[PDB]
Amino acid sequence: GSTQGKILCFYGPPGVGKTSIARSIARALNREYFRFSVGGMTDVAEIKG
Amino acid sequence: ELLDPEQNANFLDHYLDVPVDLSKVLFICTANVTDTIPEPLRDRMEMIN
Amino acid sequence: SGVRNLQKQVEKVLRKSAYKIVSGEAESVEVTPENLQDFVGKPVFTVE
Numbered sequence: 065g066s067t068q069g070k071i072l073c074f075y076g077p078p079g080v081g082k083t084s085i086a087r088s089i090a091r092a093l094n095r096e097y098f099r100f101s102v103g104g105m106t107d108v109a110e111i112k113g
Numbered sequence: 114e115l116l117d118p119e120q121n122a123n124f125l126d127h128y129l130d131v132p133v134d135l136s137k138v139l140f141i142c143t144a145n146v147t148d149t150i151p152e153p154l155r156d157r158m159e160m161i162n
Numbered sequence: 163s164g165v166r167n168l169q170k171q172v173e174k175v176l177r178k179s180a181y182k183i184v185s186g187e188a189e190s191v192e193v194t195p196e197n198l199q200d201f202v203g204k205p206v207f208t209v210e
C-alpha cells in the first residue's frame with residue numbers, strides 16, 4: 065500500500081555510477097535527496113549532536 | 114537505532130531530546146565491498162551488486 | 163524481561179494503523195496475526 069522501509073546496499077567497483085543512480089531514484093520517486101558520507105568516523109556525537 | 118524501520122519513528126539526539134519521526138525516510142548505503150561491514154549491520158540490508 | 167520493548171513495537175504498529183485511518187483507506191483497521199507482518203514487516207528473529 066503505502067511506502068515501507070527496508071534498508072538496501074549497493075556495492076561494486078568505485079565509479080560504477082552508484083550515487084548517480086541513487087539521486088536518479090530520488091528524482092524518480094520525487095523524494096528529496098541528501099548524500100551523507102560516513103567513512104571512517106567514530107564520533108557518534110556527529111550522528112546525535 | 115537509525116536504520117531500524119521502527120525505531121527511526123522516535124529517533125532522538127542529545128541536543129533536542131524530543132523524538133523525531135523518520136519513518137518515511139529512504140536510507141541507502143554504498144560500500145565498495147559488502148563483506149567488511151560488521152555482520153549485524155550487513156545482515157539487515159540487502160547487498161545488491 | 164521488561165515490557166518496554168513490546169510497548170514500543172505495539173506503539174509503532176498502532177501509529178501505522180493511525181496513518182492508515184487519518185489519510186489512508188480503511189475507516190477501521192482490523193489487525194490479525196497474519197496481517198501483522200504487513201504493518202511491521204517480516205519477522206527478524208525466529209530460531210530460539
Ligand SMILES: Nc1ncnc2c1ncn2[C@@H]1O[C@H](COP(=O)(O)OP(=O)(O)O)[C@@H](O)[C@H]1O
Binds near residue numbers: 078079082083084085
Ligand atoms: N550508466 C551510466 N550513465 C551515465 N553516467 C554514468 C554511468 N555510470 C557511471 N556514470 C558516471 O560515473 C560517475 C560515478 O559516480 P557515482 O556513482 O555518482 O559515485 P561513484 O563515483 O562512487 O560511483 C558519475 O559521474 C556518473 O555520471
